Amino acid sequence: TYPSVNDLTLEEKASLTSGGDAWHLQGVEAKGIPGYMITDGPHGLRKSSVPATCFPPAAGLSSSWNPELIHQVGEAMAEECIQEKVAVILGPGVNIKRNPLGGRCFEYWSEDPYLAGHEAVGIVAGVQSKGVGTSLKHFAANNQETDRLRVSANISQRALREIYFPAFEHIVKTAQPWTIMCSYNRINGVHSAQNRWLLTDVLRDEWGYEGIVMSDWGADHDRVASLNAGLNLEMPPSYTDDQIVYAARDGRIQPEQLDRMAQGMVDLVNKTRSAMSIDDYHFDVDAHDEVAHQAAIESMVLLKNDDDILPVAANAKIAVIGEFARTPRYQGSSHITPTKMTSFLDTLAARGVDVAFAPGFTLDLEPADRTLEAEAVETAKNADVVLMFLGLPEAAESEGFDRETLDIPAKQVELLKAVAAENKNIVVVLSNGSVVSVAPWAGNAKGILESWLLGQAGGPALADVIFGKVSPSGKLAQTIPMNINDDPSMINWPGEEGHVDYGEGVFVGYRYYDTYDKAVDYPFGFGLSYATFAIDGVNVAKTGANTAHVTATVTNTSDVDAAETVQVYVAPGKAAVARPKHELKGFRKVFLKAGESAEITFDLDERAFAYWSEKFNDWHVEAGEYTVEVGTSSRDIAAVAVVTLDGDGKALPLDEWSTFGEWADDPVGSKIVA
Known part of the structure; x- marks a missing residue:
């Protein structure tokens, strides 16, 4: 044609x-x-x-x-x-x-x-x-x-x-x-x-x-x-x-x-x-901005929420501190000129929410301004709740460069410490393109909302979550470690003399942390919500020689409508190759009103249980027991169940150099054992 x-x-x-x-x-x-x-x-x-x-x-x-x-x-x-x-x-x-x-x-x-x-x-x-x-x-x-x-x-x-x-x-x-x-x-x-x-x-x-x-x-x-x-x-x-x-x-x-x-x-x-x-097509600006609004809402992860400081009562005396609230950081040149963008400050202003704003710090590498710092202390001293917006300025994530630290700017930490001396009811909202460390300063914040980069609609989305119009439902897609030197790749990062050796192998991120019993600040798949959920009725059933099926019920046990993300991990037994303790093999997000329950299912195909064998030059499901874990986090497992698979039957040419165990596991050699 x-x-x-x-x-x-x-x-x-x-x-x-x-x-x-x-x-x-x-x-x-x-x-x-x-x-x-x-x-x-x-x-x-x-x-x-x-x-x-x-x-x-x-x-x-x-x-x-x-x-x-x-x-x-x-x-x-x-x-x-x-x-x-x-x-x-x-x-x-x-x-x-x-x-x-x-x-x-x-x-x-x-x-x-x-x-x-x-x-x-x-x-x-x-x-x-x-x-x-x-x-x-x-x-x-x-x-x-x-x-x-x-x-x-x-x-x-x-x-x-x-x-x-x-x-x-x-x-x-x-x-x-x-x-x-x-x-x-x-x-x-x-x-x-x-x-x-x-x-x-x-x-x-x-x-x-x-x-x-x-x-x-x-x-x-x-x-x-x-x-x-x-x-x-x-x-x-x-x-x-x-x-x-x-x-x-x-x-x-x-x-x-x-x-x-x-x-x-x-x-x-x-x-x-x-x-x-297609001639003369014009997209709906407001309709697309609403998709960005909903996408922005679900981009936030609630890390900590002591005493349920979030949500804020909306009628409270609010102290907003941090230049990010007036000059937002919402993307990564990669610059997109937004159709419409409204900061968090202009969002509260347009909503009648009366607040007291203090920049507190500047978004540059300049030293700390004691004058701005003192103004931010006088604010929040007269306030029910202080919403402090911290994170990485653009120069801390310069294009074409890898970061050299996980920490947020030190003068922002100093301001948080100073504010905490006069008002302990602090919610910190984070703006950052990649993981920042949290534990070194988390003691000065009752609530910590990790909002990453939210796009052009971050303003309204932050107001809806912080003031309880919607509950946050984000789960970490990235591990937050206690220290970058815990990462098994840091030894081979960023490399030298034109090469970088991925010496950690398949043990990347939580695959390493969960296998060697290492502490992390916040685990992969973690996230808090304004609601509470319970998982029961978990049933795992074998559906083939090397496949299984998962059935579970998740229930909103609170008075708040919110979403929960159920996660399924596969924890294999001792294998012929090194494997992480568990790996994510399925997930389902469910929006549930107060008191509602939902039945959700997961299919686990052969690839959910298979590793790559360089000996077979192919995927391989090894015979034995595999633990299916159901939960809401990589370290929040609600129920487990063991399934026993047959193995995929792949055989190897056997020779003199092999071991009896290689024949014992081979279908052709299993008959030679007895």
């Missing part, structure tokens, strides 16, 4: 393998192939500073554990693309947060592969449900900014298969992103743009990826090598398509390979053609 690569000359085929400019696909308009615009936006359209809805960055939205809501954010993002003639929006990013100091953590979802895949899929399915393409971003293992253009992430196969791949694998198999962006870095000596094993063997031959692969901007170093590896599109164009033409003529590129790569670029245009032919 016209057009295809059969309708193109060699020069036209090769031109399709690199964009028209830094923001457009290659246009062959003479043969009906328009060069549609490609632009950023993991949390909203970022064209070019064109007003768009700034949704909460993923570091916040990952607190929702709500794929349906994330799917809804994607639909709004696509409709804005349809207005602005944008065929592909460059997101979402699903790289594992190996270390919380990673500079791009604000744009990623979790430290856990299952959570990242089952959350971020909402962006892909949502956007493309409107006919607009996405770009599953930085494939793969782009977990740091330090030396990102050169460093080789040296990773074992197990860690690649179990940690850094599954989020990519799930989104490719469940949805089907029309575009994938490879990472700048090398993996075991090979740049991703040039890695045929990554882009072809794994992505396409094993997983069935049907879409296109593009490079990150500048990531294509060898035009011919990248094309042969499976990279369809060089971005931005270096104006070197002549190298594809020459190589296609002298046998360095098989004609089938160029046809496959270029035809994919034609298919992308055809997949996005309908949405780009």
